[PDB]
C-alpha cells in the first residue's frame, strides 16, 4: 500500500481534477507518481495565481519563488481564498512526495514551475493585446506544462528522448488545450472580471470585450469567435506529430483523449451563439464515445478530420475568416 502521504496526494489529484484524474491514475510505472505530483505543484501555483485578494506586489514574489518552495519542508500558504486552497495549505504534503521522486523528475517539474512563475509575474499588469502576445500567455500557462510533461515522458524511458527534445511540438499541444478553453470560456471568465481574448483582435469589433456579452453585438461576437477558433486551429498539425510519436499506450491516451476532446469543443463552439449566453460543451455520451475510440493514430486522425469537415461545411459565407478558415482545415487534412 502507498505511503500515507502519497495516498493523500492522489486524493487532491481526484478533488481538483475532472480532465485529469483518470489518465494520470492509468499511467504505467513511475510515470503515475510524477505526473501526479507535476500536476499538484502547477495546480497550487495556479491557485495563487487566479487569486484576487492578493495584492499584485505580494503576489510577484510567490510566484517568482514558488519553484524554491518545493524544496522547504514546511512552506504553506494560508491566507487564500481559493475554492482549491486546501492544496496551499497542505503544500508540504505534496513538496514531501516531490521530493521522494527520482532527481530526474524533481529537475523536470522544478523548472517548469520556475519558468511558469516568472510568466505568470509577467501578465499581472497586462492583458493580453497581440496574437503573439496571447501566444506567450498561452506557452507561460499552457505550453509549459506539454514540455514538462514531454520530458517527463522522456526521463522515464516509455517514450522516445524526441519526445522530450522537440519543444514547439510540445508547446503546440498546450497551446491548443489552452485556447479552445479561453475561447470556450469567454462568458464565465468576464462574469468573474477576467479578460483572457487578444485585445488586438477583440478591439476590431467592439470597444470593450465584454460588450461581446450584449445580445446587440452577438453577430460581431461570433465573427470573433470564429476568427479565434481558426487561430487555434493553425496548432493541430502539431498536435498530430505530437501524438504521431507516442509509444506507451497510457501515454498516449493521457495525451490523446484532452486533444480530442478540446477538437470536439473547438466544432461545438464555431459559428455557435450559445459561446455568448453559457458555457458550450459536448455531450457526455459522445465524451464516453471519443474516450473509447481514441487509443490509436488512426482512430485519432479520424475524429480530428470527423470535426474538421464538420467546421468547414458551416463556414459562413460572408465569414471574414472564412478563406483562412479553409486553407488550415486543407492543411490538416492533406498532412
Ligand atoms: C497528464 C495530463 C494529460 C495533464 C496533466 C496537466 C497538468 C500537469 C496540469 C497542471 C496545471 C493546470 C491545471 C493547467 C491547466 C489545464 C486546465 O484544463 P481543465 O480542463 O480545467 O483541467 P482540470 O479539470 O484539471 O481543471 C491547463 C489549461 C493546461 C493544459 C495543458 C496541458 C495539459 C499540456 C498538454 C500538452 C501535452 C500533453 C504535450
Ligand atoms: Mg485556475
Ligand atoms: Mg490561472
Redesign the pocket.
Given at each position: 500500500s502507498l505511503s500515507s502521504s502519497l495516498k493523500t496526494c492522489y486524493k487532491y489529484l481526484n478533488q481538483?481534477?475532472?480532465?485529469?484524474?483518470a489518465?494520470?491514475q492509468a499511467?504505467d510505472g513511475e510515470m503515475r507518481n510524477a505526473?501526479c505530483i507535476?500536476?499538484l505543484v502547477?495546480?497550487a501555483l495556479?491557485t495563487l495565481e487566479d487569486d484576487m485578494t492578493i495584492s499584485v506586489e505580494k503576489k510577484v514574489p510567490l510566484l517568482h519563488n514558488f519553484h524554491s518552495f518545493l524544496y522547504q519542508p514546511d512552506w504553506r500558504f494560508m491566507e487564500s481564498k481559493e475554492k482549491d486552497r486546501q492544496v496551499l495549505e497542505d503544500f508540504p504534503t505534496i513538496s514531501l512526495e516531490f521530493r521522494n521522486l527520482a532527481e530526474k523528475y524533481q529537475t523536470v517539474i522544478a523548472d517548469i514551475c520556475r519558468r511558469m512563475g516568472i510568466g505568470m509575474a509577467e501578465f499581472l499588469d497586462k492583458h493580453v493585446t497581440s496574437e503573439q502576445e496571447w501566444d506567450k500567455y498561452c506557452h507561460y500557462?499552457?505550453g509549459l506544462?506539454?514540455?514538462?510533461?514531454?520530458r517527463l515522458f522522456s526521463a522515464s524511458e516509455f517514450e522516445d528522448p524526441l519526445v522530450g527534445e522537440d519543444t514547439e511540438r510540445?508547446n503546440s499541444?498546450?497551446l491548443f488545450?489552452?485556447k479552445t478553453?479561453i475561447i470556450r470560456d469567454y462568458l464565465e471568465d468576464q462574469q468573474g472580471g477576467r479578460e483572457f481574448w487578444p485585445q488586438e483582435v477583440w478591439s476590431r469589433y467592439v470597444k470593450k470585450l465584454g460588450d461581446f456579452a450584449k445580445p446587440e453585438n452577438i453577430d460581431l461576437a461570433v465573427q470573433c469567435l470564429n476568427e479565434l477558433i481558426t487561430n487555434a486551429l493553425h496548432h493541430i498539425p502539431d498536435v498530430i506529430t505530437?501524438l504521431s510519436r507516442l509509444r506507451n499506450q497510457s501515454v498516449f491516451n493521457?495525451?490523446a483523449?484532452?486533444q480530442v476532446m478540446a477538437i470536439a469543443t473547438l466544432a461545438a463552439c464555431y459559428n455557435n451563439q450559445q459561446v455568448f449566453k453559457g458555457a458550450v460543451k459536448i455531450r457526455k455520451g459522445q465524451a464516453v464515445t471519443l474516450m473509447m475510440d481514441a487509443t490509436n493514430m488512426p482512430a485519432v486522425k479520424a475524429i480530428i478530420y470527423q470535426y474538421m469537415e464538420e467546421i468547414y461545411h458551416r463556414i459562413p459565407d460572408s465569414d471574414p475568416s472564412s478563406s483562412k478558415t479553409r486553407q488550415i482545415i486543407s492543411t490538416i487534412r492533406t498532412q
Amino acid at each position: 500500500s502507498l505511503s500515507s502521504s502519497l495516498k493523500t496526494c492522489y486524493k487532491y489529484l481526484n478533488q481538483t481534477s475532472r480532465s485529469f484524474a483518470a489518465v494520470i491514475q492509468a499511467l504505467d510505472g513511475e510515470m503515475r507518481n510524477a505526473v501526479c505530483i507535476f500536476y499538484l505543484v502547477l495546480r497550487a501555483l495556479d491557485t495563487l495565481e487566479d487569486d484576487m485578494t492578493i495584492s499584485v506586489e505580494k503576489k510577484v514574489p510567490l510566484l517568482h519563488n514558488f519553484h524554491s518552495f518545493l524544496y522547504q519542508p514546511d512552506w504553506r500558504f494560508m491566507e487564500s481564498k481559493e475554492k482549491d486552497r486546501q492544496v496551499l495549505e497542505d503544500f508540504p504534503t505534496i513538496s514531501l512526495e516531490f521530493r521522494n521522486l527520482a532527481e530526474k523528475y524533481q529537475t523536470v517539474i522544478a523548472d517548469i514551475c520556475r519558468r511558469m512563475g516568472i510568466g505568470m509575474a509577467e501578465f499581472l499588469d497586462k492583458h493580453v493585446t497581440s496574437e503573439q502576445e496571447w501566444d506567450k500567455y498561452c506557452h507561460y500557462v499552457a505550453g509549459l506544462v506539454g514540455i514538462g510533461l514531454s520530458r517527463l515522458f522522456s526521463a522515464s524511458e516509455f517514450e522516445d528522448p524526441l519526445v522530450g527534445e522537440d519543444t514547439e511540438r510540445a508547446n503546440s499541444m498546450g497551446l491548443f488545450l489552452q485556447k479552445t478553453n479561453i475561447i470556450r470560456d469567454y462568458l464565465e471568465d468576464q462574469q468573474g472580471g477576467r479578460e483572457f481574448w487578444p485585445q488586438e483582435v477583440w478591439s476590431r469589433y467592439v470597444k470593450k470585450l465584454g460588450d461581446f456579452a450584449k445580445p446587440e453585438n452577438i453577430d460581431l461576437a461570433v465573427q470573433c469567435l470564429n476568427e479565434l477558433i481558426t487561430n487555434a486551429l493553425h496548432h493541430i498539425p502539431d498536435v498530430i506529430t505530437y501524438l504521431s510519436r507516442l509509444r506507451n499506450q497510457s501515454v498516449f491516451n493521457a495525451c490523446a483523449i484532452p486533444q480530442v476532446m478540446a477538437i470536439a469543443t473547438l466544432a461545438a463552439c464555431y459559428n455557435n451563439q450559445q459561446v455568448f449566453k453559457g458555457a458550450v460543451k459536448i455531450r457526455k455520451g459522445q465524451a464516453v464515445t471519443l474516450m473509447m475510440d481514441a487509443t490509436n493514430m488512426p482512430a485519432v486522425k479520424a475524429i480530428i478530420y470527423q470535426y474538421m469537415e464538420e467546421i468547414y461545411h458551416r463556414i459562413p459565407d460572408s465569414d471574414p475568416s472564412s478563406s483562412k478558415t479553409r486553407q488550415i482545415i486543407s492543411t490538416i487534412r492533406t498532412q
